[PDB]
Amino acid sequence: DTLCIGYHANNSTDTVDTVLEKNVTVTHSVNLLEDKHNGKLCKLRGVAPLHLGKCNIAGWILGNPECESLSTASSWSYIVETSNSDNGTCFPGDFINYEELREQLSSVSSFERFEIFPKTSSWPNHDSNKGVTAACPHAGAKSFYKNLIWLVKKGNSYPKLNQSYINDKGKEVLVLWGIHHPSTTADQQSLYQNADAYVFVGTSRYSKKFKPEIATRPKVRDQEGRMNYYWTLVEPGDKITFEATGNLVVPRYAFTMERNAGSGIIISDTPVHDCNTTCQTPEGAINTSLPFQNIHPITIGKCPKYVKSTKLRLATGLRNVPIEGGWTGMVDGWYGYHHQNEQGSGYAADLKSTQNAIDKITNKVNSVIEKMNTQFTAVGKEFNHLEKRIENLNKKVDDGFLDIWTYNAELLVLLENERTLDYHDSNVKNLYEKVRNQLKNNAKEIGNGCFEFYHKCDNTCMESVKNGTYDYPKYSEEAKLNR
Amino acid sequence: DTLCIGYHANNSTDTVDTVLEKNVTVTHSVNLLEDKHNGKLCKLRGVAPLHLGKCNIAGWILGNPECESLSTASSWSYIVETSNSDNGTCFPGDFINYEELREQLSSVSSFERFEIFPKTSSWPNHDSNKGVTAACPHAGAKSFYKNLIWLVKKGNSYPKLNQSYINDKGKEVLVLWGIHHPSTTADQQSLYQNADAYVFVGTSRYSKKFKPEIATRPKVRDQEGRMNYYWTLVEPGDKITFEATGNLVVPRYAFTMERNAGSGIIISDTPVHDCNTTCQTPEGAINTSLPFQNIHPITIGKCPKYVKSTKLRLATGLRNVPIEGGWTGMVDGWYGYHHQNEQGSGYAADLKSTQNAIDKITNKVNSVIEKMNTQFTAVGKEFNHLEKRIENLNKKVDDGFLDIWTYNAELLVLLENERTLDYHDSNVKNLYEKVRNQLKNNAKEIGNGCFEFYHKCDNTCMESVKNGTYDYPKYSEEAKLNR
Amino acid sequence: DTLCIGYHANNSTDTVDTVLEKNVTVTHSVNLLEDKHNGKLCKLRGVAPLHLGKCNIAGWILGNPECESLSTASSWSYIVETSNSDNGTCFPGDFINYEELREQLSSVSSFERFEIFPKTSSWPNHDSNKGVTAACPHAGAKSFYKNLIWLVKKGNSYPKLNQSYINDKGKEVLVLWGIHHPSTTADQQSLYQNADAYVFVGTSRYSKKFKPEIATRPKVRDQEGRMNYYWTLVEPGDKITFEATGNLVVPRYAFTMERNAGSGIIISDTPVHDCNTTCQTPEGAINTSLPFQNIHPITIGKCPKYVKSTKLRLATGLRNVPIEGGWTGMVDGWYGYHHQNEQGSGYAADLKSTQNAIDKITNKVNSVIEKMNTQFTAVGKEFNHLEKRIENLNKKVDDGFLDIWTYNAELLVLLENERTLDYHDSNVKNLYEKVRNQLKNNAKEIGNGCFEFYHKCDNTCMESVKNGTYDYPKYSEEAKLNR
Ligand SMILES: *[C@@H]1O[C@H](CO)[C@@H](O[C@@H]2O[C@H](CO)[C@@H](O)[C@H](O)[C@H]2NC(C)=O)[C@H](O)[C@H]1NC(C)=O
Ligand SMILES: *[C@@H]1O[C@H](CO)[C@@H](O[C@@H]2O[C@H](CO)[C@@H](O)[C@H](O)[C@H]2NC(C)=O)[C@H](O)[C@H]1NC(C)=O
Ligand SMILES: *[C@@H]1O[C@H](CO)[C@@H](O[C@@H]2O[C@H](CO)[C@@H](O)[C@H](O)[C@H]2NC(C)=O)[C@H](O)[C@H]1NC(C)=O
Ligand SMILES: *[C@@H]1O[C@H](CO)[C@@H](O[C@@H]2O[C@H](CO)[C@@H](O)[C@H](O)[C@H]2NC(C)=O)[C@H](O)[C@H]1NC(C)=O
Ligand SMILES: *[C@@H]1O[C@H](CO)[C@@H](O[C@@H]2O[C@H](CO)[C@@H](O)[C@H](O)[C@H]2NC(C)=O)[C@H](O)[C@H]1NC(C)=O
Ligand SMILES: *[C@@H]1O[C@H](CO)[C@@H](O[C@@H]2O[C@H](CO)[C@@H](O)[C@H](O)[C@H]2NC(C)=O)[C@H](O)[C@H]1NC(C)=O
Ligand SMILES: *[C@@H]1O[C@H](CO)[C@@H](O)[C@H](O)[C@H]1NC(C)=O
Ligand SMILES: *[C@@H]1O[C@H](CO)[C@@H](O)[C@H](O)[C@H]1NC(C)=O
Ligand SMILES: *[C@@H]1O[C@H](CO)[C@@H](O)[C@H](O)[C@H]1NC(C)=O
Ligand SMILES: *[C@@H]1O[C@H](CO)[C@@H](O)[C@H](O)[C@H]1NC(C)=O
Ligand SMILES: *[C@@H]1O[C@H](CO)[C@@H](O)[C@H](O)[C@H]1NC(C)=O
Ligand SMILES: *[C@@H]1O[C@H](CO)[C@@H](O)[C@H](O)[C@H]1NC(C)=O
Ligand SMILES: *[C@@H]1O[C@H](CO)[C@@H](O)[C@H](O)[C@H]1NC(C)=O
Ligand SMILES: *[C@@H]1O[C@H](CO)[C@@H](O)[C@H](O)[C@H]1NC(C)=O
Ligand SMILES: *[C@@H]1O[C@H](CO)[C@@H](O)[C@H](O)[C@H]1NC(C)=O
Ligand SMILES: *[C@@H]1O[C@H](CO)[C@@H](O)[C@H](O)[C@H]1NC(C)=O
Ligand SMILES: *[C@@H]1O[C@H](CO)[C@@H](O)[C@H](O)[C@H]1NC(C)=O
Ligand SMILES: *[C@@H]1O[C@H](CO)[C@@H](O)[C@H](O)[C@H]1NC(C)=O
Secondary structure, three states: OEEEEEEEOOOOOOEEOOOOOOOEEEOOEEEOEEOOOOOOEEEEOOEOOEEEOOEOHHHHHHOOHHHOOOOOOOOEOOEEEOOOOOEOOOOOOOEOOHHHHHHHOOOEEEEEEEOOOOOOOOOOOOEOOOOOEEEEEEOOEEEOOOOEEEOEOOOOOOOOEEEEEEOOOOOEEEEEEEEEEOOOHHHHHHHHOOOOOOEEEEEOOEEEEEOOOOOOOOOEOOEOOEEEEEEEEEOOOOEEEEEEOOOEEEEOOEEEEEEOOOOOEEEOOOOEEEEEEOEEOOOOOOOOOOOEEOOOOOOEEOOOEEOOOOOOEEEOOOEOOOOOOOEOOOOOOOEEEEEEOOOOEEEEEOHHHHHHHHHHHHHHHHHHHHOOOOOOEOOOOOOOOOOHHHHHHHHHHHHHHHHHHHHHHHHHHHHHHHHHHHHHHHHHHHHHHHHHHHHOOOEEEOOOOEEEEOOOOOHHHHHHHHOOOOOOHHHHHHHHHOO | OEEEEEEEOOOOOOEEOOOOOOOEEEOOEEEOEEOOOOOOEEEEOOEOOEEEOOEOHHHHHHOOHHHOOOOOOOOEOOEEEOOOOOEOOOOOOOEOOHHHHHHHOOOEEEEEEEOOOOOOOOOOOOEOOOOOEEEEEEOOEEEOOOOEEEOEOOOOOOOOEEEEEEOOOOOEEEEEEEEEEOOOHHHHHHHHOOOOOOEEEEEOOEEEEEOOOOOOOOOEOOEOOEEEEEEEEEOOOOEEEEEEOOOEEEEOOEEEEEEOOOOOEEEOOOOEEEEEEOEEOOOOOOOOOOOEEOOOOOOEEOOOEEOOOOOOEEEOOOEOOOOOOOEOOOOOOOEEEEEEOOOOEEEEEOHHHHHHHHHHHHHHHHHHHHOOOOOOEOOOOOOOOOOHHHHHHHHHHHHHHHHHHHHHHHHHHHHHHHHHHHHHHHHHHHHHHHHHHHHOOOEEEOOOOEEEEOOOOOHHHHHHHHOOOOOOHHHHHHHHHOO | OEEEEEEEOOOOOOEEOOOOOOOEEEOOEEEOEEOOOOOOEEEEOOEOOEEEOOEOHHHHHHOOHHHOOOOOOOOEOOEEEOOOOOEOOOOOOOEOOHHHHHHHOOOEEEEEEEOOOOOOOOOOOOEOOOOOEEEEEEOOEEEOOOOEEEOEOOOOOOOOEEEEEEOOOOOEEEEEEEEEEOOOHHHHHHHHOOOOOOEEEEEOOEEEEEOOOOOOOOOEOOEOOEEEEEEEEEOOOOEEEEEEOOOEEEEOOEEEEEEOOOOOEEEOOOOEEEEEEOEEOOOOOOOOOOOEEOOOOOOEEOOOEEOOOOOOEEEOOOEOOOOOOOEOOOOOOOEEEEEEOOOOEEEEEOHHHHHHHHHHHHHHHHHHHHOOOOOOEOOOOOOOOOOHHHHHHHHHHHHHHHHHHHHHHHHHHHHHHHHHHHHHHHHHHHHHHHHHHHHOOOEEEOOOOEEEEOOOOOHHHHHHHHOOOOOOHHHHHHHHHOO
C-alpha cells in the first residue's frame, strides 16, 4: 500500500519568464499587459467626442465655409481630428496662441454659440456685405468665415468703429477677431479709406493695439496679403471693447463656454461609435483593468501605463511538467494525494492546502493590479515649430516614464514569477513533511514524494493520513513485524 | 521533562499588509509614511521666509501703498503669500514677465533697497509731485507706488528725459519701471505735452522701444487707461539708460540683490513661527527622516516623496498570534525556549538568534530609509492663463512621479512584509533543527515545536541544549532504557 | 571513511551589500555601474561631431570673422562647444530664437552653404562694400560677418530694396538676416538716407515688419547701436521675400539642410578623437552595456541611466568565507564534495549542480542588464535668463528621474544580493540532503555538512554516492555490524 504527494498538471502550453529561467511552462497564468483594443473611438465619462471630419479646430471655431455641414455639440470630452483635416484657416495668416486655444477647447462642460454683434444692427456705418474672398469659397462663390465679419468702407468712408460687449453670461465667453494686412497701400485704401489705420482691442486683463503691416507677400491660396487671428476669453461681468479705424475683422458669433478640467486632441482616422470607455487610444478604446498596455504612448483617460514590453505574463500556477513530475489526472486541485491499496486507487486534491494557495496567489495578483490606481490624464501635447525645446522636454518626460515603467514592469513580472513557482514547490514539500510527521516509522520513503506503508492501510486510513488524524501507535506493532 | 522552541507575542493590534495576505498582525513594525506636520511655517536652511501678509509679490516689489507697513528682510529662503493677498498692482495693467520675476525672487542671499534715482536731484526738469492716482489711495489720499515716480509735464513742457545708472555694486540690480497708457489723446497731452511720445530703455543685453497705446478701456479700479510694468536685471559693471519724451514711470528705488539657487512660493494662511525645518509644506512643516509623505504634493526642501497611499507599515517583527502559536510570556526576546522539569519551568530568550535577527532587520529598515537620499527642490511652479500647455506639462511630471512613487512604495512594503515574516519563521525553524541535531535519539518530537526527553534533563542540561553543547552520548544509555 | 558537502572559496576581497547585511565578501560578482570613460569625444552613429573650437553657434552660423578658419562638415551628429567659445555675435544685439536654432542645428543629415543672394548681382542699387565695423575686426581691419551683407546708401540714395529667393532645393533652407538700429538719427541718415525706414520679411508661414529703434545705448564692443538677428526656415517650393527701405542686413549665404531627428550640444574642453561610441558624455565617451552610470547626468545617445550611487555590485557567487566554511582547494566549481578513505582523498566539484547554478545566475545577471533597453536621447537642454521657469521644470524632470533610478537601482542590487547568497546556500543544503537520502542508515551525520560511513567506501562507492546511484542494501549488513 502506498500514498504519494504530488501536484497538478495539464495540457497548457503558455509560459512565463522568471529572472532565473526563461520559457517556464505553467498550469495557470494571467496577463498584466493589454495588447488589444476594440478598434473604435468611444465616449469618456459618458460624453461624446467632438468629431471634426474635414475641418481642424481653427476651421471649426472660425467657421470655415466647409464646416457649415458640421453639427456642433453642446459639450464634449475630447476632440477628434482626422489625418486629412486640412480645412483650417482659409485666409492665410497666423492664428495667434493657436496651440493654447486648441488645448483650452479640448474639454468643455458646455458650449453655446451666440450672435455677439448682430450683423444687421451692430455695424450701421460699415459695409458688412463685401467681406468676401476667393480664398474662402462656398459652392464656387466668394465667401468668408461664418463667425466673422470683414467690414469694408461704406460710401468711401470708414468712420471710427466703436462697439463693446458686456458678458452677462455666468460663463466665460470666447471672442475671436482678426486683423487684415493688405498686400499694397492701394488695397488698404480700397478697403478702408484711412490708410493709416489702427485697431485696438481690450478687456480688464487684456489690451493690445495693432497696426496694418502692408507689404507684398508670396501668394498663399491666391492671396498676396494676410489675415491674423486673435482671441481672448472674457470673464463673467467683464467687457470687451473693439475700437478701430480699419483692418478689423469683427466677431459675429462668440462662444459661451465652460472649460472642463482638461483633456486632449486625438488625431485618427478611426470612426466614432456609440460605446463607452475609460481610456481612449488613437488606435481604438482600451477596455481593461490591467496596469499596463503596449498599444500606444498617447492616451486620454484613466489609462494603463504604456510599456514597450510585449509580454507580461504573471504566473499563478505551478510548473506544468508531465517528485518526478505532475499528475495530469489530478484535475480537482493544485496539490493533492494519490493512493493505492487492495481496495482501490486514484487521486484526490488536498482542498485545504490548495484553497489556501489559491487565495494567497489570487490576492497577490490583485495586489499588483489594484495598486496601480491611475489618474485621468490627456498625455498628448502639441507644440509649434518655434517650440522645439519644450516639445523635446515633453518627449524626455514620456521617454523617461516609458523606460521606468517598462524596466520595472518587466522586472516585476520576473521577480514575481520565480518565487511563485518556488512557493508552490514549498507547499508541496510541506505536504510531504506533514505526512512524514504522522507516519514516522509506519512507512518508508521510496522516492518520488511517495511513502510505502509497513501495514495494511484501508480507505479509512488513507483518509486519516490526509486529514492529519493518523494514529501512529495503532499500526506500530504491525510495522515492527514487517521490518 | 520537555524543551520547546517558540516565539514572542504581545498585545499589539496594528497590522501590515503583505502581497499575499492582508491585515497581518505583527508584534513590531515601523512607519515609512509621514502623515503629520507641526502646523507651522518654519525656517529653511536657518533662514526665515518673507511673509507678505496682505500684499502679493508685485505689490511688494513695486511698493503698493498698503505694503508700507511691511518690514522687508535682508534675505529669505522662500516667499509666503496668503490666500487673500490681493494688494498687487494698484494701477491696472500688465506686469511683464511677472511669473519669471516671482520665481527669481523666490530665494535671495541678500536684498537691499536703495534710491537709484534720488527724487530731489534726478528729475529737475519734470514734475515728480503730481504722479498720483485714485487707483492707489493711501489713507484716502491720492497716491502712488512707493518705489516708482510718475513724472508729469512741468510748465506745459516735457523736455527729453535722459538718465542712467551704473551698477557699482558687486551684485545684480533689479530695476523696475512702467509705461503709462492714457485713455485719450487729451490725457496724453494733459500729462506729457508731446502727444507722440516714446520711451526707450536699455542695458548691454536689453533694448526696447515703447510707444503709448492710447485707447479707451473698460474701467478697472476707476481707470480707463493702463500702466504696464517692466523690469530687468543689471549685471555688475553695466549701465541702464532711460530715455523718454513722456509716458515713462521712472524707478525711484531699485534692489541690489543676489539670487540664491532657487526655491518657491507658498500660498497659505498658515502662520510663520520661529522654528526650523528641512521640508516646508503649505499645510505646515514636516519633521521626519522617512522616505515618503502623504501630506501634500507641493513642498520646498529636502522633502520625502509624495505618495497618495495612506499606509506604509513595514514589518520588523514576527506575526503576533496568541508551533501552535506565540508565547506572550517570553518578553525578553523574539525567539527562545520554554522548559519544564522537576526543578522548575519558564521562558528564556535565545539571545544570539534574537540579536542576530534584530540587527539584520534593523539594518534592513535603515536601508529602505537611508537610500532615498532626497535633494533640495521647490516642486511648485506658476504659469499664467496663456501658458496652459506648459502648466499641464508640469502636471504630467508631478502626476507621473506620483504614480511611480505610489506604486513602487506600496509594492515595496508588500514585497518586504511578506518575507520579513517568512524570515522570522525560518529562524524559528532553524532553532528547532539546531536542538533536534543535538538531541538525536535522546528525545522525541511531540508536535508544537517541542521535544520530550527520554532522560532526566536538569537545569544544567537544559542550558547545555540551548547553548549548543549538549552531550548526546552521556544520556544515550538512559534513553535506551526508557524505549 | 568520510564524504563532505561544501562550497568554493578563494582570495577575493571585494564585497556586495545586501538589504540585511553590509560588506558581504563574495567569491564572484559583477558591476552594474559604469564609472569610467575613455576621456575622448567620439562619433555617434558613425558620424563626427561639429567642433567649434573658438566660435559658438551664433558665430559659426553668421560667419564671425574668427570662424573663417573653421572647416564646416557636410553633416554632424552633435555639436561641441568649448568652455571659452566666446566668438558669437560680434555686432551686439539680440539673436532671436537663438536657443531654438541651437537645438534645430544640433543634428543634421546634410548641410550645404550656398550663395543665396550673389554679392555682385543681387544688390546693384546699394553699396555692399561699406558694410564694415570696428566691432567685427579681421586681422585688425574693419570687417563684418561673412554670411551677411550690410548694405549702405549709394550716391546718397537708398531705393526700395526688393529681392526674393525661391527654394528649388529638395531640402529646407535656413536664411538669416539682421536689422540695424543706429544710435542716433544722424547715423540713420548717414547710412540709409530715408530716416523713416522699415524692413519687411516673409514666407508662406512667416510675416513680420520691423522698424528701426533709434536710441543711444551703453557701449558694447564700442557700439552705441545694436544689430538684431533673425532667421527662418524656408520649406521646399516656398519663397522668401525681402522688402526694405533701409536697416536691412541681407543674407549673402544660406544653408540648405536637413534636420536629423534631434540631438544636443556638449560644452567641453575634451578633444575630439577618431573613435566610435553609442553614448557621449561631456567628460568623455562611455563604452559599456551596463544599465547604469555615475559619470554625468547629461549625455547624448543610447546611454545608461544616471544614478548618484557609487557602487552597484551584483553578486553572482557565494559568500567567500575561508558547514563551517568554504574550501579554497575546490577550484573546479562552486559546489562539490570532499572525500577521504584508505585509498586517497581530495576535492571534486559537483558539475551538474554547479553548472545549473551558473546558468541560472548568469541568466539572472543578463536579465537585469538586458531589460534596461535604453533609447537614443539628447538629455541636455538650454534656456535663457527669461526662461527660468521652464529651465527649472527641466531640472525637476532630471532630478526626479535621478532619484527614482538611484533609489530603485540601489535597492535592486540590495534585493538581489541577499537572495543570491541564500540561493547558493539552498543548493548546497540540497546536495547535503541528496546524499543523506541515499546513505540513510549506512552513514552518520557528524556536523560540518559531513557524513561518516559505517562501512568501507572505496573510490567506486564515493563516485556512486556523488552520481546518485548509491546502493543502500549492498552495504546495509556491514553498517549493522558496526553499530
Ligand atoms: C478645404 O480643403 C480642401 C482640401 O482638402 C481645399 O481644396 C484644395 O485647394 C487648393 C488651393 O486652391 C488646390 O490646389 C487643391 O487641389 C484643392 N484640393 C481638393 C481636393 O480640391 C479647399 O479649398 C478648402 N476650402 C476652404 C474654404 O478652406
Ligand atoms: C455610457 O454610460 C452612461 C452613464 O454614465 C449611460 O447612460 C445611461 O443610459 C441609460 C439607458 O441605457 C439611462 O436609463 C440612464 O439614465 C443613463 N444614465 C445617466 C447618468 O444619464 C450610457 O447609456 C452608456 N453608453 C453606452 C453605449 O453604454
Ligand atoms: C488693497 O486691497 C483691498 C482689498 O483687499 C482694496 O480694497 C477694495 O477696493 C475695491 C475697489 O475700490 C472695492 O470694490 C472693494 O470693496 C475694496 N475691499 C475692501 C475690503 O475694502 C484696496 O483698494 C487695495 N489698495 C491698493 C492700494 O491696492
Ligand atoms: C535653526 O538653526 C540655526 C543653525 O543653522 C540656529 O542658529 C544658532 O542659534 C544659536 C542660539 O540658540 C547660536 O548660538 C548659534 O551661533 C546659531 N548658529 C549659527 C550658524 O548662526 C537657530 O537657532 C535654529 N532655530 C531654531 C528655532 O531652533
Ligand atoms: C573673438 O573673441 C575674442 C576673445 O576670445 C575677442 O577679443 C577680446 O575683445 C575685447 C573687446 O575689444 C577685449 O577687451 C579683450 O581683451 C579681447 N580678448 C583677447 C584675448 O584678445 C575678439 O574681439 C572677438 N572677435 C570677434 C570678431 O568677435
Ligand atoms: C565607426 O563605425 C563605422 C560603421 O558605422 C565604421 O565605418 C566602416 O569603416 C570600414 C573601414 O575600417 C569600411 O570598410 C566600412 O565600409 C565602413 N562602414 C560603413 C557603413 O561605411 C568606422 O570605421 C568606425 N570608426 C572607428 C574609429 O572604428
Ligand atoms: C486541452 O486544453 C484545452 C484548453 O485549455 C482544454 O479545454 C482541454 O480539456 C484540454 N485537454 C485535455 C485532455 O486536458
Ligand atoms: C526560449 O528561450 C530562448 C533562449 O534560450 C529564447 O531565445 C526564445 O525566444 C524562447 N522562446 C519562445 C518565444 O518560444
Ligand atoms: C469590457 O467592457 C464591458 C462593458 O463596459 C465590461 O462589462 C467588461 O468587464 C470589460 N472588460 C474588461 C476586461 O474589463
Ligand atoms: C478531520 O479532522 C477533524 C479534526 O481536526 C475532525 O473533526 C474531522 O471529523 C476529520 N475528518 C474526517 C473525515 O474524519
Ligand atoms: C498592552 O500594550 C501596551 C502598549 O504597547 C503596553 O504598554 C502594555 O504593557 C501591554 N499590556 C500587556 C499585559 O502586555
Ligand atoms: C481587512 O481585510 C479586508 C479584506 O478581506 C479589507 O477590506 C479591510 O479593509 C481590512 N481591514 C481593516 C482596515 O481593518
Ligand atoms: C523633530 O525635530 C527635532 C528638533 O529639530 C529633532 O530633534 C527630532 O529628531 C525631529 N523628529 C524626527 C522624527 O525627526
Ligand atoms: C557555551 O558554549 C561555549 C563554547 O562555544 C562555552 O565557552 C561557554 O562556556 C558555554 N556556556 C555555558 C553557560 O556553559
Ligand atoms: C589571488 O587572487 C588573484 C586575482 O584573482 C589570483 O590570480 C591568484 O591566483 C589568487 N591566489 C591564490 C593562491 O588563489
Ligand atoms: C563596512 O560596514 C560599515 C558599517 O558597519 C560601513 O560604515 C563601512 O563603510 C563598510 N565598509 C567599507 C567601505 O569598507
Ligand atoms: C569597448 O569598445 C570596443 C570597440 O567598439 C568593444 O569591442 C568592447 O566590447 C567595448 N567594451 C565594452 C565593455 O562594451
Ligand atoms: C551516473 O548515473 C547514470 C544514470 O542516471 C549512469 O548512466 C552513469 O553511467 C553513472 N555514472 C557513472 C560514472 O557510473
